[PDB]
Design a protein around this ligand. Structure first.
Ligand SMILES: [Mg+2]
Ligand SMILES: [Zn+2]
Ligand SMILES: [Zn+2]
Lengths: 98, 72, 1316
DNA sequence: AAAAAAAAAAAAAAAAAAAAAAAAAA
DNA sequence: TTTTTTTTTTTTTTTTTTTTTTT
């Protein structure tokens, strides 16, 4: 079972799992440790920001790929902002700085 | 390329190798700055690594080329 | 984008600003039209449109009306994303106390107001009252009341005095607190008060209050007044497959909260009685509690931090069952065509668009769907050289993900290089591997330069190659090079390997026949110049054929052996070390090819006749039966006990099992008895099973043993080995009961495997969590301190030589060979195999070497402190994160784990470490020092042995002498605690009161009785204070003066002692005066958590003479008086332990008082950081060595460094720290360094070993801990402290989604930090 | 008929930590 | 008779998804 780009989850814009849904594999905690065990940094950022979470990022990467460019635009993980909003829902005041 | 250990022999850091290779490949991929070494129907990555092996690429040639480009 | 992130507590004004309206309706939609209800949970005019750039009423469906809000429905025509971003709020009629601060244990509001949590809970739950501004009344400010006392206060103080109950009361309390007076009075009390619990609570409160005033916060903010509400998008109303709605409980909780708040407002409008509104307020508080504790969304294995931030599903992925293929090269792996065409679909579309074969991307879509032959050429173009990551399921070590060049192949299985399988721990019984695709040029170069399988042929755990050929290649090679006495082509001469191959393949010559040939070997002994040497070599035909595959540099003798598994492994290691990397990769591919091919040519099958049952099995078994029957009848007659009979039977069964083992090995290994072209000759056997066991392909002597000979003796459920062992073996039949016993043996092993893996996962989890931050940052700290490195001997042969320990590290001080004043190497030069061998031949016994735990690096580790980066030759690079690789190396082998006298052997001189001896009466040399040790220095001069000699031993020889090999010298009596005497003289009865202190017990066997000293309790209290004292006196009766001091020789015995001698008998030096009566993975987990063992062996807290204190006041008190220092310290001891120190002993600080397991914390506070890390690394290394797995000490060392990252202050010094404060070590280090560089003075600190989880919680970066092992506590602390996040480590940056400052990204960080 | 918790199965094993109770004074 | 220390006891953490009861 494989995938290139299909429907994402609603609550968090992440690729679906499983086989019944046309999903993608899980880059789990252990895999992240194994990646950062190397000096591999850009690949991890691509895995967990542009290929899985960043709603605007992945669309732009797709468009660049179709245009022969392999350029990465950082943006920000969507689920990160989701977590920020959720914890702001509690009695917690968290914000971003300069 | 079987491996890039020779590139490390040329640039012992093993990390700036990746940065310079990616910079050269990005510059020569999107447009302009044609590769200076013959290719083998390979992607920009492989030819950039081969050029780093050949020694014509280093940590200074990219900077001086950018400076000359800036000067014009 | 943002260098750092900040956190603070919620304020009503900020809550109002965040929201964009009040959701007054506890409703979903109008349920009369399809227009969502006004100010409902899904409110358009509060949040935004449901459809992009279209109003709810449809007034403006056009972009030109962007920004302008309608009036018919009041919906601001924007993108639907505004619904995701815009929040909401609920104005609560009654204030609500936030619940996280209520049950945090310790509660924030709890100790902030300095009242018990029970009273706070009772007050908030509307079942009590509290005092607000008691004033001139009988009621204290913090006093709480009940309904009866409320009525009493009303009757007596219904005037100005006032009180409340619940949320409003607590809000009034918080609003009516100052902070200046609180801080001042609390500081005064801390300075004056000297009680541990009050002092601790007071300093905790001072820290909380000073942090709060430092932060821009007010206590009332911790009580909710306006409740924020999540954007509707994050709480979607998903309809199930039909006419129904099934969304999260969040919508239900919000509906409940809004309904209850509306009901409370309505009742307050109605002015209901206080009881009904009280119930309403309590219900509203419960509803807010249920809505808040979101926690689960943030908590749990399925929380945002762990399920959606760290471990994130990713596109461009796939998976499949794996399968073998020889034809692949190590730098590439196969790939099913379908997954190739599916993964690179964006890439193929782009390549087709650029190629011009199509214009609209839909044309390329229809092309790929049609499977047009053009698409395959595009696939070969994109796949040309474009690595992909092949990852297995349990990613334990960094090798769990390796890059590979795809090679499109038909089928549906991920073909894998065979060799690399060994690294993955991947067997082909159906395991499923995942394929990921790097996208960007950064990532492609990153995968090819680091994760390519070529770049990883040396493991990070240790220097052993990881590409060790596994099972089939090894058997083929071994069968290719193995001499038989005679065969076709035996006894000729070959001009070279080429015609050897020609002869074998033609069938004219056997694959192996001892024969002389001509081989040319190339050697680079000169300055990197190849020299050719050739001559006649006696070898084997298959061996000569193999020689064509070795590169030039290697010698020839390397392939003149049988080439077992270990031989091939070290042969590849030699190739890697002498010829670099590329030759080794080519050589590994070739060795796999030439192993599989000749294994195929061998036809090494296994039939049932390949395992012969030795004839002695029956006879050995029958003799064993006769012996066990004889011992059984001997027990029947009563000559022995049941235990003695059991032990005897087990021992003889073990001996018979060994006999059968030896018989079977003799039968197998030299089975071959064939002609030599003469009469007869024996040779190493060609029996199939023996070949597959000797080569090391599969199994070993242990495994073959139960295929032919008896299985031995299996364990009944609890290891209690049955006295009727399995007399049968697998080749023969097994009866029913023997199989039942084997099931007993095997089910426990399977269940072990399962739960052991479960636990090892969590051990690795903690290990990586506690060593996330450490990233190599500095080349060298320029520090001279280090740890001593020596070979390890437990009391026998050396378990692990000095070379293995020292290899790959950086020396701290110059090596001083025993040619004293000979500078063998510089004091700070790296060490590798050549220098290691030079030290070895120099016979260097101990070396000072640099360790990360000693490094003076700031927020990191000095590179030279880490030495050689395993998995690569040269030294560590600037950046490569050591913490995660070290944690993985320590944790991965967790799966492999499983949950008298001395006879000196070698010949050498005798050395005594910590020597304090005396000549006994017989003339032998006894030891009067508990901590003395014996070294056997070989003739060379090095330490080849070391033995712990207990107190009062026996020695035939003396110091500085020589003992032949095997000469028993060390011996002692471990039964009774000796009372040996230092001097010689008469023995009186001094303070031996008979009838009150002691008793007379008669030895019935002989009649020669002996005085008996009872304990302190059994006798009278009057005799309790009367000490039993044995004093030595001279012939004249005068006291004997011990040399070195004026004190006489008096000995004080403990309770339950048996005094041997009587009055009127002289005693020599060293006479016993009284007969004194007397683990697997969990061990590693306990060790790294650094927990107090069951019996915390207590060491000497301070140097000085020792004495006893108050007796049986719960425990016995020992007081050590320093000779020149201060005595007043005391030590309580459970006196029922068999202590080691007498009453008149002078010992050094940190000397064992009661033996047993040693607590790490006391070891530090008594020995030192180097000593405790030595103990930890040695013990865990012993645990791993128990199973044979090898882990380089550096990883344990760095983990230990992280475990002690925290420390405590002993004095504030000229700084502004609190003495009772407890802070990160490097913080005080840099502070005191900058203070000392100036004219001021520094402070003093004591280090402590916080357990791996404990030290992990000390991580200042709350984001790390907020994602690790808890959310409640970490978030509570971050909120109260208002701790800004620095984003320095590796885990937090992953959460933020920016480049990790570990590998390549480090350079980028090195740029960004340069900006500021 | 409408609104609201979990008292309504559950316990193991072990550990960390907080609160209460019991020595042992002067 | 009060107060500090230690011990003991209670409670809260550590690797597949909600009806019945009351007003
Ligand atoms: Mg398997
Ligand atoms: Zn409208
Ligand atoms: Zn250092």
């Amino acid at each position: 079972h494989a995938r290139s780009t299909g429907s994402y989850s609603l609550v968090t814009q992440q690729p679906l799992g499983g086989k019944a849904q046309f999903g993608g594999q899980r880059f789990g905690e252990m895999e992240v440790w194994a990646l950062e065990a190397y000096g591999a940094a850009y690949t991890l950022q691509e895995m967990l920001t542009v290929k899985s979470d960043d709603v605007n990022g992945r669309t732009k990467m797709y468009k660049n790929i179709v245009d022969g460019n392999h350029q990465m635009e950082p943006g920000m993980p969507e689920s990160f902002n989701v977590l920020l909003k959720e914890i702001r829902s509690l009695g917690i005041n968290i914000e971003l700085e300069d | 390329r079987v491996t890039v250990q020779d590139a490390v022999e040329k640039i012992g850091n093993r990390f700036d190798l990746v940065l310079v290779a990616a910079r050269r490949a990005r510059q020569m991929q999107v447009g302009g700055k044609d590769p200076l070494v013959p290719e083998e129907n390979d992607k920009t990555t492989v030819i950039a690594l081969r050029e780093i092996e050949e020694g014509l690429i280093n940590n200074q040639i990219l900077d001086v080329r950018e400076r000359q480009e800036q000067q014009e | 984008e943002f260098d750092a992130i900040k956190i603070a507590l919620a304020s009503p004004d900020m809550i109002r600003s965040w929201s964009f309206g009040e959701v007054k309706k506890p409703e979903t939609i109008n349920y009369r039209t399809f227009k969502p209800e006004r100010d409902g949970l899904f409110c358009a005019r509060i949040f935004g449109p449901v459809k992009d750039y279209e109003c709810l009423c449809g007034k403006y469906k056009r972009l030109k009306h962007r920004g302008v809000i309608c009036e018919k429905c009041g919906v601001e025509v924007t993108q639907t994303k505004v619904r995701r971003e815009r929040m909401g709020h609920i104005e609560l009629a009654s204030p609500t106390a936030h619940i996280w601060f209520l049950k945090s244990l310790p509660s924030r509001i709890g100790l902030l107001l300095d009242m018990p949590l029970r009273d706070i809970e009772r007050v908030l739950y509307f079942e009590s009252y509290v005092v607000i501004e008691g004033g001139m009344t009988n009621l204290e400010r913090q006093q709480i009341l009940t309904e009866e006392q409320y009525l009493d206060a009303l009757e007596e103080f219904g005037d100005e005095f006032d009180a409340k109950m619940g949320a409003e009361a607590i809000q009034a309390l918080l609003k009516s607190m100052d902070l200046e007076q609180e801080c001042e009075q609390l500081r005064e009390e801390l300075n004056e008060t000297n009680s541990e619990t009050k002092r601790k609570k007071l300093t905790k409160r001072i820290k909380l209050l000073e942090a709060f005033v430092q932060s821009g916060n007010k206590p009332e903010w911790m009580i909710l007044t306006v409740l924020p509400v999540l954007p509707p998008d994050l709480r979607p109303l998903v309809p199930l497959d039909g006419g129904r709605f099934a969304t999260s409980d969040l919508n239900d909780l919000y509906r409940r909260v809004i309904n209850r708040n509306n009901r409370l407002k309505r009742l307050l409008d109605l002015a209901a009685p206080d009881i009904i509104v009280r119930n309403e307020k309590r219900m509203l508080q419960e509803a807010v509690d249920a809505l808040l504790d979101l926690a689960d969304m943030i908590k749990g294995k399925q929380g945002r931090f762990r399920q959606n931030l760290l471990g994130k599903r990713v596109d461009y992925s796939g998976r499949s069952v794996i399968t073998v293929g020889p034809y692949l090269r190590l730098h590439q792996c196969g790939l099913p065509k379908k997954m190739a065409l599916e993964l690179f679909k964006p890439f193929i579309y782009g390549k087709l668009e650029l190629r011009g074969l199509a214009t609209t991307i839909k044309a390329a879509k229809k092309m790929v769907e049609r499977e047009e032959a053009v698409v395959w050429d595009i696939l070969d173009e994109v796949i040309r050289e474009h690595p992909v990551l092949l990852n297995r399921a349990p990613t334990l070590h960094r090798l769990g993900i390796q890059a590979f060049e795809p090679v499109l192949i038909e089928g549906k299985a991920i073909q894998l290089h065979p060799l690399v399988c060994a690294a993955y721990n991947a067997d082909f019984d159906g395991d499923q591997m995942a394929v990921h695709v790097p996208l960007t040029l950064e990532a492609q170069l990153e995968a090819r330069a680091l994760m390519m399988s070529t770049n990883n042929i040396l493991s990070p755990a240790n220097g052993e190659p990881i590409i060790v050929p596994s099972q089939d290649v090894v058997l083929g090679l071994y069968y290719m090079t193995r001499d038989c006495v005679n065969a076709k082509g035996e006894g000729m001469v070959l001009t070279g390997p080429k015609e050897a191959e020609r002869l074998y393949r033609s069938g004219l010559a056997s694959l192996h026949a001892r024969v002389k040939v001509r081989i040319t070997e190339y050697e680079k002994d000169a300055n990197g110049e190849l020299v050719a040497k050739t001559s006649l070599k006696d070898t084997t035909v298959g061996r000569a054929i193999l020689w064509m595959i070795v590169p030039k540099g290697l010698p020839y003798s390397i392939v003149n052996q049988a080439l077992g598994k270990k031989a091939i492994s070290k042969m590849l290691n030699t190739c890697y070390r002498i010829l670099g990397l590329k030759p080794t990769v080519i050589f590994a591919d070739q060795i796999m090819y030439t192993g599989f091919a000749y294994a195929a040519r061998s036809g090494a099958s296994v039939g049932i006749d390949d395992m012969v049952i030795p004839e002695k099995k029956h006879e050995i078994i029958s003799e064993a039966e006769a012996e066990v029957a004889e011992i059984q009848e001997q027990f029947q007659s009563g000559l022995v006990t049941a235990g003695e009979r059991y032990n005897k039977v087990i021992d003889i069964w073990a001996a018979a099992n060994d006999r059968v083992s030896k018989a079977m090995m003799d039968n197998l290994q030299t089975e071959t008895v064939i002609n030599r072209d003469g009469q007869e000759e024996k040779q190493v056997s060609f029996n199939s099973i023996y070949m597959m066991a000797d080569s090391g392909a599969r199994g070993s002597a242990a495994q073959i043993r139960q295929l032919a000979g008896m299985r031995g003796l299996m364990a009944k459920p609890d290891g209690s080995i049955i006295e009727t062992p399995i007399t049968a073996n697998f080749r023969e039949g097994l009866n029913v009961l023997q199989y039942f016993i084997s099931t007993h043996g095997a089910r426990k092993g399977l269940a072990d495997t399962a739960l052991k893996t479960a636990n090892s996962g969590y051990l690795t989890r903690r290990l990586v969590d506690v060593a996330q931050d450490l990233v190599v940052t500095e080349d060298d700290c320029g520090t001279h301190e280090g740890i001593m490195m020596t070979p390890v001997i437990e009391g026998g042969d050396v378990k692990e030589p000095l070379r293995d320990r020292v290899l790959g590290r950086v020396t701290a001080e110059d090596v001083l060979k025993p040619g004293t004043a000979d500078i063998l190497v510089p004091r700070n030069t790296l060490l590798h195999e050549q220098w290691c061998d030079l030290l070895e031949e120099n016979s260097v016994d101990a070396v000072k070497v640099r360790s990360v735990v000693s490094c003076d690096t700031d927020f990191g580790v000095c590179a030279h402190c880490y030495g050689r980066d395993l998995a690569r030759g040269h030294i560590i690079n600037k950046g490569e994160a050591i913490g995660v690789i070290a944690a993985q190396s320590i944790g991965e082998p967790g799966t492999q784990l499983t949950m008298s006298s001395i006879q000196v052997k070698n010949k050498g001189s005798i050395k005594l470490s910590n020597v304090k001896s005396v000549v006994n009466s017989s003339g032998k040399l006894v030891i009067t020092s508990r901590n003395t040790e014996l070294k056997l220095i070989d003739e060379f001069g090095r330490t080849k042995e070391s033995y712990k000699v207990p107190y009062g031993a026996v020695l035939a020889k003396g110091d500085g002498e020589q003992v032949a090999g095997g000469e028993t010298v060390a011996n002692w009596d471990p039964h009774t605690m000796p009372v040996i005497t230092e001097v010689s003289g008469f023995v009186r009865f001094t303070d031996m009161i008979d009838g009150q202190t002691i008793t007379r017990q008669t030895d019935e066997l002989t009649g020669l009785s002996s005085l008996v000293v009872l304990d302190s309790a059994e006798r009278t209290a009057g005799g309790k204070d009367l000490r039993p004292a044995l004093k030595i006196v001279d012939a004249q009766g005068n006291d004997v003066l011990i040399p070195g001091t004026d004190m006489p020789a008096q000995y004080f015995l403990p309770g339950k002692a048996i005094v041997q001698l009587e009055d009127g008998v002289q005693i020599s030096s060293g006479d016993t005066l009284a007969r004194i009566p007397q683990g697997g993975l969990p061990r590693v987990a306990d060790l790294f958590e650094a927990r107090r063992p069951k019996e915390p062996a207590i060491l000497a807290e301070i140097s000085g003479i020792v004495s006893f204190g108050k007796e049986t006041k719960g425990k016995r008190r020992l007081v050590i008086t320093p000779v020149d220092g201060s005595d007043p310290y005391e030590e309580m001891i459970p006196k029922w332990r068999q202590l080691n120190v007498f009453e008149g002993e002078r010992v050094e600080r940190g000397d064992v008082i009661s033996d047993g397991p040693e607590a790490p914390h006391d070891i530090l506070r008594l020995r030192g950081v180097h000593a405790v890390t030595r103990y930890i690394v040695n013990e865990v290394q012993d645990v791993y060595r128990l199973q044979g797995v090898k882990i380089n000490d550096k990883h344990i060392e760095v983990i230990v460094r992280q475990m002690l990252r925290k420390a405590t202050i002993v004095n504030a010094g000229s700084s502004d720290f609190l003495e009772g404060e407890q802070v990160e070590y490097s913080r005080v280090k840099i502070a005191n360094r900058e203070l000392e560089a100036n004219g001021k003075v520094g402070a003093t600190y004591s280090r402590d070993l916080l357990g791996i989880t404990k030290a992990s919680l000390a991580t200042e970066s709350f984001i790390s801990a907020a994602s690790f092992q808890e959310t409640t506590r970490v978030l509570t602390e971050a909120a109260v402290a208002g701790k800004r996040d620095e984003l320095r480590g590796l885990k937090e940056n992953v959460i933020v989604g920016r480049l990790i400052p570990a590998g390549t990204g480090y350079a980028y960080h090195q740029d960004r930090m340069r900006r500021r």
